[PDB]
Structure 1
Amino acid sequence: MKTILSNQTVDIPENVDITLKGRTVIVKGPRGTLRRDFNHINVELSLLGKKKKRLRVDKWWGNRKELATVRTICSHVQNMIKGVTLGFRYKMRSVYAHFPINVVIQENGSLVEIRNFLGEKYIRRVRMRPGVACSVSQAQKDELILEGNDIELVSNSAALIQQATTVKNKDIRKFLDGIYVSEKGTVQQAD
């Protein structure tokens, strides 16, 4: 109903350097650099504080619909800060029945190659996003590790695995089988 301004408080830790050149937020920290395009919303992002690094998100008029975005912007900034000081780690335990799933990762963590999936002789090769890596969890039964800096590209890479493994033309109440995401954690664990 054209409410006046609502704002959000984003406090920034000392690990990183943040920089906006418009509505293009550059966040540069210990686990590399990162930058995402907030250039499509009409929301003013400004920052303040000598070394104390306070970033305010601001929208003046808007709607119930338009004042909804001002927190999504606030929350997508959040996950970069988790994703640049720590990184994300996804633990994907491979659930299977009788038929054994054997997994290798093909070349340096890009391609993931799935063999003998449920008696599918079809080689099931799913490639990963630019900026993400894969691993097999050692001392651990058939659980998979994906790490990155951005929660889209990590979880897009996890999603491409768990939909390429789909039990088709049979009952899904039986055959509960495939690679599935378990825990959504950080690279530098529990910190």
Structure 2
Amino acid sequence: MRTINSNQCVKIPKDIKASVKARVVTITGTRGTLKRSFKHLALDMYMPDKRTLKVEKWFGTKKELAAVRTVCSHIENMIKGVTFGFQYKMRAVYAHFPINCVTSENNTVIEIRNFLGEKYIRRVEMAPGVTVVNSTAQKDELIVEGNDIESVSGSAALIQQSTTVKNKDIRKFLDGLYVSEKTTVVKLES
């Protein structure tokens, strides 16, 4: 019905310094910078002379103002991505063959093998500014660091989406590497 206003205001804290610039948002904190654009959604983004930032849509129809409540939630991920970081975890369930995953320097991509006793040495790269080292302190666990949530998660679903068992059953051949913990890196303890 082309309703008039639906604006959200992200609550910027004290430690991080943001800037919307004509729509692109560059937020600087502890762990780095996450300069990302929204030159496609076409809101009216605005830091009202304060710390905070407010998106605002005028006369968008119904689908348009659904996308207000996401860009105010993309931003507060790029808040947490630079003060606490984004870290997933992998657990690598298997039945009979131990999935001998490895990575190294540099070779902070990955190099996993013995799925499922196949000779195909599967190799999964990582998104930039994002590293994989194998998790210590645990049997067959992994750690994907990084600040951008989608460059953590999307780079940590490639290790999940292959390996998958092809051409067989999947409700009995339950092997693979799956995500167990989607955590921060710092807050509050880790």
State the TM-score bracket (shorter-chain normalisation): over 0.9
Paired residues, number = 189
* Residue from 38, 56, 70 that aligns with 2:54: 56
**One of 108, 115, 125 as aligned partner of 2:113:** 115
- Runs of 4+ more than 6 Å apart: none
Distance 2:110 2:187 in 1: 24
TM-score with structure 2 setting the length: 0.95
Q: Which residue of 2 aligns with 1:25?
A: 25
Determine if the alignment matches structure 1 residue 166 to structure 2 residue 148: no
Taking the aligned partners of 2:169 and 2:97, their CA distance within structure 1 comes to 16
Contact persistence 1:109–1:135 (CA under 8 A)? no
Aligned: 1:14 with 2:18 = no
| 1:33-54 alpha-carbon deviations (Å, 9 max, x no partner) | 111111111201111244xx12
Deviation at 1:135, TM superposition (A): 1.5
Does structure 1 conserve the Cα–Cα contact (< 8 Å) formed by 2:16 and 2:30? yes
- 1:5 is matched with 5
How do residues 41-52 of structure 1 correspond to structure 2 at under 5 angstroms?
41-50=41-50
Give SS of 2:156's match: helix
> How big is the shift at 1:159?
0.9
Counterpart of 2:72? 74
User: For residues 147-173 of structure 1, what are the alpha-carbon distances to aligned partners after superposition, in whole Å with 9 as ceiling and x for unaligned?
Assistant: 100111101111111111010111000
Q: Distance in 2 between matches of 1:175 and 1:137?
A: 25
Q: Give the drift of 1:190.
A: 3.0
Report the aligned-residue RMSD: 1.2
Letter in 2 for 1:171: D
State the 1:109 CA deviation. 5.1
SS in 2 for 1:165: coil
Letter in 2 for 1:56: K
Alignment of 1:121-136 (within 5 A): 121-136=119-134
Question: 2:30 & 2:102 partners in 1: Cα distance?
Answer: 29
1:103: how far off?
1.2
Task: In structure 1, give the amino acid aligned to 2:159.
Answer: I
Q: Are the equivalent residues in 1 in contact too, given 2:108–2:133 (CA < 8 A)?
A: no
Partner residue, 1:190: 188
* SS of corresponding position for 1:126: coil
Gaps of 5+ in 2: none
